[PDB]
Paper text:
Using such a method we successfully determined the three-dimensional structures of hemoglobin (64 kDa), α-fetoprotein (67 kDa) with no symmetry, and streptavidin (52 kDa) at a resolution of 3.5 Å, 2.6 Å and 2.2 Å, respectively. To verify the imaging quality enabled by UFG support, we prepared cryo-EM specimens using 64 kDa hemoglobin, 67 kDa α-fetoprotein and 52 kDa streptavidin applied to the UFG and collected cryo-EM datasets for single-particle 3D reconstruction.
The two-dimensional (2D) classification of hemoglobin particles showed a rich distribution of orientations (inset) that enabled a final reconstruction to be obtained at a resolution of 3.5 Å.
Numbering used by the authors:
A (entry chain B), C (entry chain D): 1 to 146
B (entry chain A), D (entry chain C): 1 to 141
């Protein structure tokens, strides 16, 4: 099962209610800084060493917007997660072979940057709901191994 | 296991935390039980509902224990050996829930200090909380 | 998604092809011995300290047969896992509050005792398939938290 | 960090392992890649199919490194510090996959020695492999 319809509506409503622009790119920069060995997967991006060049990297902010749009699709079409996360799941499993706790690190650092960008607009129900939706995203994105 | 630069950064940010240590520990346990409900078996006699006073009290206690770990920054297993004994033997707590509470505390710290929570001090404090969990998993009785 | 129909058939076929009796009780004894702090959840069983009294415990071998029958139901009705794991999931979440890596420990020690009881009847495809079915069992048994 | 009794037990069982060390490391990597396919990024140039000879060779190498850790039983981080350096810095390997391979090796050891794999020696060898993963996560460069 999953959450309440009211709390899943709160999930998509407050994710629409973020400042929709750079939260993904800042989450990428935060992930790569606070865990510096995740960029073994991201060596092809070039600018991955210093945080300032990370924020200036068009590849980093483009990957942030790409993850942001993927989250937008996965939360708009929240009913069928495993239908929406199909090509991304195939890529992450077969081509990328990402170790499945890196999705744990990324989901938790996204939770940290959303807490940073809200403060008083981040109810701990909204935090637990967001932890659940990114756990469901990480499961639907790591299932073709299995 | 840090630089003097980011050690200075975390002691300055922890001074900015300051007398909100009890409040931040209260909200850390609040978000802890609301987020990872597997952990409520370890606090059964409390009233597991919205905003409990003994939850706030124990959050104050745990937060100031982490302030003691801050004040003994390079001596962290020496400082936390008694609690490692207590947790691994007395209460018999699974040793990655310390990492769970550590990341939850980082979420509430970023929620409460967003005009200071740079990715640099974020990385420093994440390595610090990794270390606190690391010295509580070395179950030195 | 899930496995091949042929490999899920291999899962239920070889689980029917175990010596069906005491593999669950031996897995319980092995779990409680190689991890001695899981019995914080099992303090009510009495005989939990020494392995010989564990194997002699009617509560231990009864819980082994109960887990064995639950696995029998969850692998016979393998299509609807979350329908079969309903009362057990409610118990494990609400009443028991079992930390979700203890299901990881139990699934992996069951894999160890099935490897012990087969040897040459344990193909590493069958091992990976069994790891998947016990990960699905552990997910369907830890989902009412979420 | 063991008793002399179960240390004697694991060195006797490891002598029973013996010259099947290369074979057991081969099957451990076989079951490793077949079971946790996230790990095949760390061995890309190999032929990730049924029974590869270089997989068997590297399994022999890793198994005999664990035999060196057996021969240096109480000196395990001292023995494995160079590999900890290699893995955490050169190859940049996530540090719980050592626990993954440790349990997979226990599965193949129980598969190959079922007339010796008592729960007692099982618990001893599980604590041992926990220790090997523990000293490979302390990334002492
Ligand atoms: C948790 C949610 C995640 C989402 C929604 C996501 C989504 C995406 C997207 C949209 C792309 C771009 C595909 C393309 O442009 O063709 C991508 C590629 C990639 N992802 Fe992620 N990803 C996630 C997690 C991760 C994690 C945790 C890692 C760990 C390092 C990772 C590593 C990569 C890499 C290396 C690429 C290739 C870069 C590229 O194609 O430009 N992803 N992923
Ligand atoms: C991460 C760092 C942690 C620190 C510094 C810490 C600190 C403490 C301290 C100082 C006490 C003693 C309170 C007293 O005097 O009664 C305590 C008790 C306790 N801790 Fe924590 N703790 C931590 C993490 C955790 C976690 C994650 C749990 C998971 C549930 C936990 C469970 C407990 C329990 C059950 C008690 C006993 C409470 C009581 O009996 O009143 N601790 N802890
Ligand atoms: C992985 C698959 C598991 C299955 C299929 C399973 C199944 C069961 C079953 C059939 C019962 C008996 C319910 C009753 O008789 O009313 C039970 C109870 C219980 N389970 Fe498990 N369980 C699993 C995992 C675990 C784990 C990992 C633990 C960790 C300690 C655990 C702890 C308990 C406890 C403490 C009880 C209560 C004892 C009792 O009711 O007699 N279970 N579970
Ligand atoms: C658990 C104990 C482990 C031990 C004792 C061990 C031992 C070793 C040794 C001795 C080498 C050097 C081989 C050479 O001389 O080229 C090596 C290399 C390597 N290890 Fe392991 N290893 C362990 C676990 C792992 C795990 C779980 C992985 C996960 C994928 C891993 C990945 C690698 C890789 C990628 C190499 C480089 C292989 C090459 O370049 O040929 N190791 N390991």
């Amino acid at each position: 099962v999953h959450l309440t319809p009211e709390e899943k509506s709160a999930v998509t409503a407050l994710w629409g209610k973020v400042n929709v622009d750079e939260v993904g790119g800042e989450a990428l920069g935060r992930l790569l800084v606070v865990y510096p060995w995740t960029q073994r997967f991201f060596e092809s991006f070039g600018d991955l060493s210093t945080p300032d060049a990370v924020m200036g990297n068009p590849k980093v902010k483009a990957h942030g917007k790409k993850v942001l749009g993927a989250f937008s699709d996965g939360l708009a079409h929240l009913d069928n997660l495993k239908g929406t996360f199909a090509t991304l799941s195939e890529l992450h499993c077969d081509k990328l072979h990402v170790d499945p706790e890196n999705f744990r690190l990324l989901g938790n650092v996204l939770v940290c940057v959303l807490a940073h960008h809200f403060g008083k607009e981040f109810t701990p129900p909204v935090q637990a709901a967001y932890q659940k939706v990114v756990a469901g995203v990480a499961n639907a994105l790591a299932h073709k191994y299995h | 296991v840090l630089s003097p630069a980011d050690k200075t950064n975390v002691k300055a940010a922890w001074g900015k935390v300051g007398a909100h240590a009890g409040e931040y520990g209260a909200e850390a346990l609040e978000r802890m039980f609301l987020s990872f409900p597997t952990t409520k078996t370890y606090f059964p006699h409390f009233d597991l509902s919205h905003g409990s006073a003994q939850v706030k009290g124990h959050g104050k206690k745990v937060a100031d224990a982490l302030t003691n770990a801050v004040a003994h920054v390079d001596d962290m297993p020496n400082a936390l050996s008694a609690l490692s004994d207590l947790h691994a033997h007395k209460l018999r707590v699974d040793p990655v829930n310390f990492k769970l509470l550590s990341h939850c505390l980082l979420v509430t710290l970023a929620a409460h200090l967003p005009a200071e929570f740079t990715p640099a001090v974020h990385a420093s404090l994440d390595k610090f909380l990794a270390s606190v969990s690391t010295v509580l998993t070395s179950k030195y009785r």
